[PDB]
Design a protein around this nucleic acid. Structure first.
Lengths: 121, 188, 431, 48, 102, 387, 56, 137
RNA sequence: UAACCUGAACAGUCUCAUCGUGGC
């Protein structure tokens, strides 16, 4: 889809979905677009992953509009099916917010992936 | 075609050998070569207006029976000479009455529950125990606990039974040396 | 048994006799129009005269109610009491009531039938005497207040046991309750006898056929995971499919087509049962929508057929019957449809039956197997019996151009069948 | 080569839809005054 | 500003005083809000009007942010119509069940 | 009344059974299996470890089990008394994969290749003392192959002679698959995929009379799949992507000759129909290669989701009508999915099947017979009565 | 035991007595019994008095 | 218990014929009892439920008669590896025992019937059954 | 060289959670 800005390549999307899988094991992600926007409102999201695969993409491209207000990083991955597999549910997942923590075991991996995200903004 | 009662008697012993309706009655008496005589009854129809088109299938009513194979072991259940335990090659333990043949009853093989709460093994398609080599009944504590101890063909444990309940018991005694049970006894 | 049980039996026998004023009030306040306080004060003359008005309206809508005005709605029936004549007069008027109910089952959306069968409810007590036929006749209308009304005033039969939490309730029975009602076997035998009387007296209407077929295919769907229930269920629904195919209605014929197609895709039936099913399908095929459903039904019933013997030549009688109901243009056109039905095994059996039984129409089998694509075993059996056709009769241009098609695609396979039987140079010397 | 013929016979088998418990539960909503041939193709859409 | 709000907010959108008193003391929040007067919630009956207030707010968030954020939108009701078909057959499948035992 | 379009009524009034009888079926009925339990295969001689790999013989009635107790056992299996043929304990070498290889030229070698987390791989030559050899030289390529754990054995044709020879294929560190000769141990070629190599499988396709072609199918962790033609130099012919799937653990082919249903004769080599890519979430995509060799973003015919933890075995039955998903992570995690219908059999396994923690699985090439090895050290044995 | 029968003077109610103890007053033509009492000594006979409302 | 289901010597004890199961199918093999005078090829029963119920060495092309459980006596030469001739009764009853004297084969049935076959003519000569002998094996 | 992550890596002396009771 053309209007899904920054889209990740294969290596970045592989490490994004790896940190999504370990955040899902640590119960540190909110899966789903409404839960992602709730974490955006409350300011407890590290970065937002979205799927450039939903057949209306306009059900997504509104949380960019309040990501750029709270300067939280956001990124697109090409498959909602693969994002749902990574989040560890049985359904496709359209968006997922990795929530904030300061005692987290995967804090360094979250920070590395979010720096690689904000390089391409 | 109203209904089919399948395997009403054994094919190997002749199938259903004589079946007859008692006349004027919805009950039919069958008998087969497997030493068995049954009755089946037709209940009245479940539809209160149609009836003739909704025919309830025949259900089972009383039956008498014995061993279908010659018995392999024999014991007397008590000192009064009233009941006698009798095991056959068709893998059934009957308790036959010497006083009144209606009191003859097959000892049931419906197993109890496991004592700890684990699962019991065995096949899902339940078959009868291997045919009985030996048995020993001692009704000093009868009704209290297990009462008959029996030993089957080419298997390494001896089952118990309760003559009061007329059913199997909770215990199967192992031999603990990977050998088949050649004899059983029990104290008085 | 006990004394209270035997007395409950004598109460159920004497349910309709009014033995004092209080039982007469409780028994006459059961109306289908009015509430209890009006219905208890009404007379027989009042309810008879407006039921006779409504029967004149119902008779000018549909003229088969005039004989009910002659017997069931006459003025001798104001004084006719039900439980004072013998069993033979009772069975006479109860098949009169059954005739009225399965005639007026279709009319239940218009108030003259409500005001007319009001008199059967209040004079002849058909809500408690003739109650199974009343429920079975108005079973289609279960989302409607008229079925709510007959459930409120009905005394429920023992086969209709699952509706016992929807009597005197404000909410209609649901569709899952209807499938739980139909899921019984004795209820299925009862409903198929009801449909047999419907098909016999030619009263099957399309809303009934839709409801009946919906509940039947939901019964098959519910029992789709236990083969012993499906096997209990086969000679009931295939018998009612035969009795729906043995009538004249295009609607009831394609109702039977729906039942047959769902049942054959639910379990693998026998080959001979499927062939006799297609014989019963073709033996009364007269409509056009019935022809559309019949071709789709025969295609799916041959598709759901496995094992050694799925794609034989269908025999001479059934093939020439299928020819007399469906010629070449119909089969070729239906294959040329862009929706692409799955007609693999049936079309293979059809072309093999042409090669064993027609031996003139081979250009058409070239065109139709140019149209649709088949599998390797299908075209292997086709070219094997074409090889046998070449060896029995002299090989002209239609068989030659068929082998040119079987050379232009998959020539390795026709080489494999010739090497399994024959030779390529010997076959080219043959043709 | 009968094993090869048997393998091509089991190889030429296509994926079909099986009947579930609830493959036909959503038909009661629209059996209202539609025609029976529309019911037949609505069933055939479920089967295919 | 309505499009960038989550579907739970669109559910409870009218009932702010009941919501915030039921949050500022630890009570049970409302479930209907301004969306109670939709025709689908009118068709529902029981606790499943809370249930389809939830699914209606979810599909209404979908359709609403499609309408506000689309650029090639056609004013023809397509996304709203497929969302309404989803809500209608969901309402069908939870009005078909019954808590009685038959 | 009466003395003696009715075709259906007559056929119903004569028949009593209404389904296909015994052998006029030839392909499996869906949703209800027919599977009896036999004697547990290693019940005669117990295993001292979790049974890590398991393979039947291509021709003989032999089952080879092997695990981390660095011994490998062969069992003559039958119904009643699965006895132990022979048993070889390799000291200091725990084994993880063990395979019966049998060549296509003379079908008389009968090697057993076995390997674990070591820099060597043993090869026992079956002779009924025991002559085994050890492969420990990557011929210049030792840096990219630090453990011989994940190997697979396959057939390769010279393609200028019609001479076949076995290859073993070792999965290495970077993306590497090192293919080497199964008799001389010479490094033949290597195929590198881009990512974390997780699994691979071998497909064959016939070309003409007596010529076939070997294709290596290797999967990234991310989900992108390379197919290498390796009867020529090991060059890529196709590169596609798994639809969905993010943690990919196991690929398998089936429906023709796999490495676990091997062809005894070179003309009996078949093209595989099905390809299952099983993942870390328990999702198994299933692709139908009769049409999914052309698309390059092919869609699966179904994505199975029935068991919820990491797919560690998935094997196709030799006819290619059952796939067996299995997970070594929780207990009793095994399903047999019927295909083409892509529907799980619902009557087996039940809650009382003693599957255990399923850490290996194997299908018999002829008998229609499952062996399922669990972490307790027990191979349980079942027979599918369709075969 | 053997049941001594008795009807009310209009035929609406039936009063049976078992020899053993079982006395039942009932509306035999509806299915309504209004007394079933088991007086475990040997009863011999019964009668209604002026009604179904009292019996001796 | 033993994997060898059936086994018998030839007269003079020079070869042993033995039926064992091989991964759900019966197989019939012949071994020499002294090598100083392996044999790796078997007769394979191709059905999973067809099995040998008895076997007898004939005495001179050397052969085995294998009495099956579908009313058949297979006659199987051992130097070649095919059943040379398939005797059959009219039934499906398993056959409990066979014997031969010279060229005259006799066999008993699970329906307690006696059949006689002629190895020189490949024909069913006689079929009968006698009273009060009802469980013959 | 190391650090960190990772493969079926808590749990028979059963492990853990939560609400309570009595004295960690």
């Amino acid at each position: 889809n053309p209007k899904a800005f920054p889209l990740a390549d294969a290596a970045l999307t592989q490490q994004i979905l790896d940190v999504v899988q370990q955040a899902a094991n640590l119960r540190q992600l909110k899966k789903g677009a409404n839960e992602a926007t709730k974490t955006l409102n409350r300011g407890i999201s590290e970065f937002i992953i979205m799927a450039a695969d939903c057949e209306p993409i306009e059900i997504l491209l509104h949380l960019p509009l309040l990501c750029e207000d709270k300067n939280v990083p956001y990124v697109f991955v090409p498959s909602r099916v693969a994002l749902g597999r990574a989040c560890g549910v049985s359904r496709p997942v359209i968006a997922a917010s990795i929530t904030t923590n300061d005692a987290s075991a995967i804090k360094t991996q979250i920070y590395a992936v979010k720096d690689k995200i904000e390089t391409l903004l | 075609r109203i209904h089919v009662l399948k395997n009403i008697h054994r094919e190997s012993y002749g199938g259903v050998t004589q079946a007859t309706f008692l006349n004027g009655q919805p009950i039919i008496v069958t008998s087969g070569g497997d030493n068995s005589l049954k009755e089946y009854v037709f209940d009245p129809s479940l539809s209160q207006g149609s009836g003739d088109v909704v025919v309830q299938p025949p259900r089972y009513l009383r039956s008498r029976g014995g061993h279908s194979q010659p018995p392999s072991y024999i014991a007397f259940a008590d000192s009064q000479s009233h009941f006698m335990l009798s095991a056959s090659k068709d893998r059934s333990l009957w308790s036959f009455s010497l006083r009144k043949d209606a009191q003859s009853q097959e000892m049931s093989q419906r197993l109890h529950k496991k004592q700890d709460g684990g699962r019991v093994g065995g096949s899902t398609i339940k078959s009868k125990f291997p045919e009985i080599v030996a048995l020993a009944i001692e009704n000093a504590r009868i009704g209290e606990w297990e009462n008959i101890i029996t030993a089957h063909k080419d298997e390494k444990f001896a089952r118990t039974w309760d003559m009061r309940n007329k059913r199997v018991g909770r215990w199967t005694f192992d031999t603990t040396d990977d050998g088949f049970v050649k004899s059983v006894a029990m104290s008085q | 048994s006990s004394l209270s049980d035997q007395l409950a039996q004598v109460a159920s026998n004497n349910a309709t006799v009014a033995l004092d004023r209080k039982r007469r009030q409780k028994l006459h306040s059961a109306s289908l129009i009015y509430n209890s306080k009006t219905a208890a004060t009404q007379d027989y003359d009042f309810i008879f005269e407006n039921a006779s008005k409504a029967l004149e309206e119902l008779s000018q809508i549909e003229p088969k109610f005039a004989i009910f005005s002659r017997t069931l709605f006459s003025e001798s029936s104001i004084s006719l009491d039900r439980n004072v004549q013998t069993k033979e007069e009772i069975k006479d008027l109860d098949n009169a009531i059954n005739a009225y109910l399965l005639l007026a089952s279709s009319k239940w959306y218009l108030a003259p039938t409500l005001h007319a069968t009001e008199w059967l409810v209040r004079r002849f007590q058909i809500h408690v005497k003739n109650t199974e036929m009343l429920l079975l006749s108005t079973l289609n209308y279960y989302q409607t207040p008229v079925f709510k009304r007959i459930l409120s005033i009905i005394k429920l039969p023992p086969l209709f046991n699952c509706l016992s939490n929807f009597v005197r309730s404000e909410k209609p029975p649901t569709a899952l309750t209807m499938i739980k009602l139909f899921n019984d076997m004795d209820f299925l035998k009862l409903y198929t006898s009801y449909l047999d009387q419907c098909i016999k007296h030619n009263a099957t209407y399309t809303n009934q056929l839709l409801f009946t077929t919906c509940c039947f295919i939901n019964v098959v769907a519910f029992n789709s995971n236990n083969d012993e229930k499906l096997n209990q269920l086969v000679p009931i629904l295939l018998e009612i499919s035969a009795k729906l195919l043995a009538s004249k209605s295009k609607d009831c014929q394609i109702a039977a087509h729906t039942i047959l197609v769902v049942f054959a895709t639910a379990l693998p039936l026998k080959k001979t049962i499927i062939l006799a099913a297609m014989e019963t399908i073709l033996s009364n095929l007269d409509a056009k929508e019935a022809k559309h459903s019949a071709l789709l039904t025969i295609c799916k019933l041959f598709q759901t057929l496995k094992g050694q013997g799925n794609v034989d030549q269908l025999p001479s009688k059934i093939f020439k019957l299928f020819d007399s109901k469906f010629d070449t243009v119909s089969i070729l056109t239906f294959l040329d449809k862009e929706d692409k039905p799955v007609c693999d095994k049936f079309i293979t059996s059809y072309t093999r039956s042409i090669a064993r039984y027609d031996r003139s129409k081979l250009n058409i089998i070239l065109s139709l197997l140019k149209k649709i694509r088949l599998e390797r075993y299908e075209v292997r059996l086709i070219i094997t019996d074409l090889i046998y056709l070449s060896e029995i009769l002299e090989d002209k241009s239609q068989l030659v151009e068929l082998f040119e098609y079987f050379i232009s695609i998959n020539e390795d396979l026709v080489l494999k069948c010739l090497k399994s039987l024959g030779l390529t140079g010997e076959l080219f010397e043959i043709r | 080569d009968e094993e090869d013929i048997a393998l091509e016979f089991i190889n030429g088998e296509k994926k079909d839809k099986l009947v579930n418990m609830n493959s036909f539960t959503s038909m009661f909503d629209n059996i209202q005054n539609v025609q029976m041939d529309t019911f037949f193709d609505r069933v055939m859409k479920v089967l295919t | 500003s309505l499009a960038k709000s989550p579907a739970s907010t669109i559910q409870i959108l009218g009932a702010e005083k009941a919501l915030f008193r039921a949050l500022k003391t630890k009570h049970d929040t409302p479930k209907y809000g301004l969306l109670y007067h939709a025709s689908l919630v009118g068709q529902a009956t029981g606790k499943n009007k809370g249930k389809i207030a939830r699914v209606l707010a979810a599909k209404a968030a979908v359709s609403l942010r499609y309408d506000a954020l689309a650029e090639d939108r056609d004013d023809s009701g397509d996304i709203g119509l497929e969302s309404r078909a989803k809500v209608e057959n969901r309402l069908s499948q939870l009005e078909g069940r019954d808590l009685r035992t038959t | 009344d009466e003395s003696d379009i009715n075709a259906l009524t007559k056929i119903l009034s004569t028949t009593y059974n209404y389904k296909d009888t015994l052998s006029n079926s030839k392909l499996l009925p869906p949703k209800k299996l027919d599977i009896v339990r036999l004697k547990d295969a290693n019940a005669s001689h117990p295993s001292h470890s979790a049974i890590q790999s398991l393979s039947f013989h291509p021709s003989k009635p032999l089952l080879l089990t092997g695990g981390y107790d660095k011994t490998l056992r062969i069992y003559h299996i039958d119904g009643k008394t699965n006895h132990l043929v022979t048993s070889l304990h390799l000291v200091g070498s725990p084994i993880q994969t063990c395979t019966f290889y049998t060549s296509l030229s003379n079908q008389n070698q009968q090697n057993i290749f076995t390997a674990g987390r070591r820099r060597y791989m043993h090869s026992w030559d079956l002779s009924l003392t025991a002559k085994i050899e050890k492969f420990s030289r990557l011929y210049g390529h030792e840096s990219t192959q630090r453990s011989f754990e994940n190997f697979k054995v396959a057939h390769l044709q010279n393609s200028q002679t019609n001479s076949v020879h076995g290859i073993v294929l070792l999965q290495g560190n970077n993306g590497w698959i090192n293919i080497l000769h199964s008799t001389s141990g010479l490094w033949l070629m290597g195929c590198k995929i881009e990512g974390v190599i997780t699994d691979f499988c071998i497909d064959y396709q016939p070309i003409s009379r007596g010529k076939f072609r070997t294709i290596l199918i290797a999967v990234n962790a991310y989900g992108e799949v390379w197919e290498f033609d390796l009867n020529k130099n090991g060059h890529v012919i196709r590169r596609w992507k798994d639809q969905g799937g993010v943690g990919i653990t196991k690929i398998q082919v089936g429906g023709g000759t796999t490495t676990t249903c091997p062809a005894l004769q070179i003309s009996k080599i078949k093209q595989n129909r099905w390809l299952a890519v099983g993942s870390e979430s328990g999702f198994v995509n299933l692709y139908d290669r009769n049409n999914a060799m052309t698309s390059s973003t092919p869609t699966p015919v179904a994505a199975l989701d029935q068991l919820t933890t990491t797919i560690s075995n998935l094997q196709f039955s030799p006819d290619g009508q059952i796939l067996c998903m299995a997970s070594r992570a929780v207990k009793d995690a095994l399903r047999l999915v019927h295909l083409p219908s892509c529907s799980v059999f619902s009557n087996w396994p039940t809650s009382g099947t003693p599957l255990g923690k399923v850490t290996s699985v194997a299908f018999s090439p002829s008998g229609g017979l499952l062996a399922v090895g669990n972490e307790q050290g027990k191979v349980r044995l079942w027979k599918l009565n369709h075969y | 035991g053997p049941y001594h029968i008795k009807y009310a003077k209009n035929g609406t109610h039936l009063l049976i007595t078992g020899r053993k103890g079982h006395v039942a007053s009932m509306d035999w033509r509806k299915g309504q019994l209004r007394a079933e009492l088991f007086l475990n000594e040997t009863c011999h006979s019964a009668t209604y008095l002026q009604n179904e409302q009292y019996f001796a | 218990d033993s994997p060898v289901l059936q086994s018998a010597y030839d007269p003079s004890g020079q070869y042993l014929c033995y039926v064992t199961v091989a991964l759900d199918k019966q197989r019939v093999g012949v071994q020499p009892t002294q090598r100083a005078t392996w044999n790796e090829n078997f007769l394979y029963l191709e059905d999973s439920k067809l099995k040998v119920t008895c076997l007898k060495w004939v005495n001179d092309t050397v052969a085995i008669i294998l009495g099956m459980n579908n009313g058949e006596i297979w006659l199987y030469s051992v130097l070649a590896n095919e059943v040379t001739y398939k005797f059959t009764t009219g039934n499906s009853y398993e056959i409990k025992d066979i014997d031969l004297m010279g060229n005259q084969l006799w066999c008993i049935d699970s329906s307690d019937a006696f059949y006689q076959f002629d190895l020189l003519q490949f024909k069913l000569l006689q079929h009968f059954r006698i009273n009060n002998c009802v469980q013959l094996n």
